[PDB]
Design a protein around this nucleic acid. Structure first.
Ligand SMILES: Nc1ncnc2c1ncn2[C@@H]1O[C@H](CSCC[C@H](N)C(=O)O)[C@@H](O)[C@H]1O
Length: 327
DNA sequence: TGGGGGCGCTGAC
DNA sequence: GTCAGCGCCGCC
């Protein structure tokens, strides 16, 4: 994550729904905002959240009375994506994990925050012939909010990961915000190899599979894209190897394959998956952030998370818009 | 709400 | 056909 000198969100309160690791919290707090409520039902996510912020998020949001949620200015929510991801079954709203947005709408209707800031996977934007996004849009408009949605790739914002996500920023209409803008892309000068840990700290992650098939030569020039170098097995998810001179593939939460949830990389002649700390860095998390003691849970948590830097630029722009109140 | 890994299909070229 | 995906499923 980056440093934010001008705290655009100072004095603003926000809630951290579907908190996970608290990526939205790091992002908004870096801009000066104050978190007044967090919600996350996963036992392990609650533990790591507590390790880093000192509070245990409240459980199952579908059972929380929206009237008991503290007043706030910005509602943050990177809601479940299994039901919308290109990697899943795409049952969408028909999925038990796909109706969480309506819980968000329920809370918004009641608390009417100034801003609603949501995130989901790229496929969310085209799911069900675009009907899914339209539904979110119409729901927000009905609740009297504007709707700004755009898919941003983390590689365009200083982080070496091809993580494409749709970000939805909504302003309550009475605020008449007409100048919100998604941050503009800039050249990437950081690649996977710049975030790796020393070899001595990741030796245990080195795997030597005799079914390894190198399909492309390593590149010596850094490039802002994923560069596949080979595969193991049939080359399915988690069985693909990439160059560290390129960018990281999208980290996942329930992913499988021998290089589960991070993908494999060629590092100093050997092939290995990423270490949880490297996952943190590829997600823009500061080294000061404490990862969960269970590596499997840590991989899952970062795989479900958000790239801090991207949210920071967006949060900064939300604040910039809110602060422009000329006479 | 465990931890590991083989998979197989979809979306967007 | 190319290829990558906050995933799925069954195993222990
Ligand atoms: N009913 C529910 N109540 C509370 N949390 C829920 C929930 N259903 C799913 N979740 C939580 O929703 C999260 C979605 S992933 C979002 C992660 C978050 N942006 C962070 O930065 O990491 C998961 O952690 C999941 O456990």
């Amino acid at each position: 994550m980056i440093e934010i000198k001008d705290k655009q969100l100072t004095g603003l309160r926000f809630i951290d729904l579907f908190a996970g690791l608290g990526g939205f919290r790091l992002a908004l707090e870096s801009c000066g905002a104050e978190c007044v409520y967090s919600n996350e039902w996963d036992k392990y996510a609650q533990e790591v959240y507590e390790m880093n912020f000192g509070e245990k998020p409240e459980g199952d949001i579908t059972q929380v009375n929206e009237k008991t949620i503290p007043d706030h200015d910005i509602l943050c929510a990177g809601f479940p994506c299994q039901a919308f991801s290109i990697s899943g079954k795409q049952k969408g709203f028909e999925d038990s994990r796909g109706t969480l947005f309506f819980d968000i709408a329920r809370i918004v209707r009641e608390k009417k925050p100034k801003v609603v800031f949501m995130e989901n996977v790229k496929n969310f934007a085209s799911h069900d012939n675009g009907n899914t996004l339209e539904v979110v849009k119409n729901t927000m408009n009905e609740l009297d909010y504007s709707f700004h949605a755009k898919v941003l790739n983390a590689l365009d914002y200083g982080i070496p990961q091809k993580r494409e996500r749709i970000y939805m920023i909504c302003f309550r209409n009475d605020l008449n915000i007409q100048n919100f803008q998604f941050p503009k892309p800039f050249e990437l000068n950081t690649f996977v190899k710049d975030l790796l840990l020393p070899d001595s700290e990741v030796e245990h992650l080195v795997i030597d599979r005799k079914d390894l098939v190198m399909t492309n030569q390593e590149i010596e020039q850094t490039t802002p894209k994923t560069v596949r170098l080979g595969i193991v097995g049939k080359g399915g998810q988690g069985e693909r190897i990439y160059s560290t001179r390129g960018i990281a593939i999208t980290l996942s939460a329930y992913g499988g394959g021998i290089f589960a949830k991070t993908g494999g990389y060629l590092v100093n002649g050997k092939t290995r998956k990423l270490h949880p700390r490297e996952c943190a860095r590829v997600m823009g998390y500061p080294d000061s952030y404490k990862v969960h003691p269970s590596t499997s849970q840590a991989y899952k948590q970062f795989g479900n998370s958000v790239v801090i830097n991207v949210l920071q630029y967006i949060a900064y722009n939300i604040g910039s818009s809110l602060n422009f109140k000329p006479y």
